[PDB]
Amino acid sequence: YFQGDSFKTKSGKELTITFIKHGSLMLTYDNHSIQVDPVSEYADYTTFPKADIILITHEHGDHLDPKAIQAVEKSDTEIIANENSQKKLGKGKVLKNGDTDTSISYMKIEAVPAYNTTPGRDKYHPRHRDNGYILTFDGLRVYIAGDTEDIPEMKDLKDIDIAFLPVNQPYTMTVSQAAKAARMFSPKILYPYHYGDTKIGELKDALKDSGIDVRIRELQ
Template sequence: MSQTRRHFLVTSAAAAGAVTLLPYAARAAAHAGDTFETGAGPITVHPVSHASFVMETPKGTIYVDPVGEPAQYADFPAADLILITHEHGDHYNADTLAELVVENTRMITNPAVFDMLPEEMKARADAVANGEMTQFADMNIEAIPAYNITEERKNFHPQGRDNGYVLNFDGFRVYISGDTEDIPEMRELSDIDLAFVCMNLPFTMDVNAAASAVSDFAPTYVYPYHYRGRDGGTQDPEDFAKRLGTGIEVRMGDWYA
């Protein structure tokens, strides 16, 4: 039986002579997942918050950009793999990682985040740059560019620094955009079964650009995520879904409970 974060934290505290109460555990349990059947086995997606989510997969449990209170992850299985797209605080937090990493956790990051990792974490991490590929549990993982193309936004995510990812589960391909605009590398993706696509201003793109790009690469399923912004920059996922029309199934995760 796989160990959950709740079990790991409670047993660790008990070994120290105390049991720590986890006030956010109920919230973690409330993040009901969507399950997608694949040739390799089921993949269950659990939105956590904004850009953070957990996938229970045939290759192990994958945490994507986990930040915030560690107890939000307490009822999920411990992470076999942690993917980090870039260094911004809603995607990377070293203190959160220190609480989530267990003995066999592996991490994949972009080079900039790798350089920021505490030394004890670098031993379990691999830096993967745009266009490079690595493997985890016989699964190919490709680092996809993620960057801004609007002139006044280029300082947020400069070209060449940050990652998106494509994970290949024996032919079932999952795209995670990270923070990006509707770049050519996104529009040129092919054979994507499940996508997670960001949209907010001023940091990424608006709903129109997101829908246009997704229409081009036409995944079977797509989650709009990372859609709250500042100064009126929040994007409407329902509007995104309407702009896509038919042929692409939109899943609305509970990203902001």
Template sequence: MNTFFSIIFSSFLFLCTSCASPEAETRVISPKDFSRELSENYNATLIDIRRPDEYQAGHIKGARPINWEDSTLFYSEVTKLAQTEPVYLYCRTGRRSAEAAQYLHKQGFNVVDLEGGYVAWVQASMETTKYESDIFSTNAGRKVSITFIKHGTLMIEVDGTIIHIDPVSSYAENYESLPKADIILVTHEHGDHYDAKAIETLSKSNTAFYSNKRVSELSGKSIAMSVGDSQEIANIKITATAAYNSSEGHENFHPKGRDVGYLLDIDDLRLYIAGDTEPIDEFSAIQNINIAFLPVNQPYTMTVEQCIQAIDSIKPHIVYPYHYGNTDLSPIVDHYKENNQIEIRIRDLQ
């Protein structure tokens, strides 16, 4: 840990000793109990406090990486956490998480520490992944897990219903190891969004496959959706939205009327998967969005400035920039740093 920040952080920890809520508690539990409690508490926060290289080598599904050794980052991220739900955390063997648990307890959090850390979790044959994922819950108690694979490729699980969006083999380490799809959604036919091999690997006999018209023609398998069309499966409403380039000279990349994005309505949770688009007039009809995936890589999709324009128009609660290549996203993060209504989350979606 940086020596200067370590001293400051340790001093802050000491000063906060008296700040602990009398109701707050810290528990250390086995991998089996840790897994069971996480499955029962969709609103809990799961934190992997290891270094980024450790996290990327493998982690517990749904864990947020917040490096304990980066004290500035850790303090900044902790201030964003709600104390209404317990915080579950782990490190490699339990030493660092014990220190972090002590700090969080003194801030008034109920903390659950994984006994033996990630090593014990793996030895207990619990599920691990190399992909980042975030977990949400709906007002009907359904768990919605979003796994960020790469670029425009996502996997969403809604209480056991698996949705693969724009699956591309080169972006996943091995689609054979991922759950088969109940639903596949493809936005358009470009090779970084449509991959017939990945779709074949993920498909079951009863997989529902939806796409724009051109992919339907190419595959001979998908149901074509035009803008405004809707389908409903497993109490998940899927609506096709407009996606196209609007800047002069860029219209040929994604012509108006060819491609689609998708709205997913899952109980009270509304997700917007924009597809390859720039800010368009149709954004005015895309409202009440909880989670939005917006592409940022001009000339093919949005500039950083256009993404900010889109966010201000749609006003989603959480924004994941995706399909961003080498784009510097820091201006977007900085623009909304003080905005309590909109949260920008950066994931590995280059």
């Protein structure tokens, strides 16, 4: 029994985000089902409806899992991924940083950077290799950062309604970094995710008076 939140788009259509765990999310919009970084360790993916779309941010095992992909795919599922993950899968569409994809009529995708800035942590997520995604449904823009630190390109993110930022150590962001990241583009709604054992409640305090709705969900 996973929690989920619902959002209305400008024409009245509904987007529901179901919070699975870590960086794993299911998005439901207009009777289409979208899985992001589905990982079998966090759910029995045979019990979900079959993915119309599977989004992979990068190749690490807590994001790219073929078993989970098999359990939830159908014959006409489109997999959208970074180059390294696509290669490992042997199927799917490759997006690089700066790519826009407008070929799904109900969901525009933009691939944006997601990498480490701390010296020595490029061993984790080196620049260019991995993607964050901006998903647009009828004007509603959802930014899924993937694994990144408070990179300067976040200043370039415009009109984001909902954002997911990663807040664990040493792989992604500390609470202060996440707060700094959030302030760079002012999403209306912020879901910290991929936060492991971080005491994430401090992010609400850290963004007090920012005007950003920080929503804590079970996304360790």
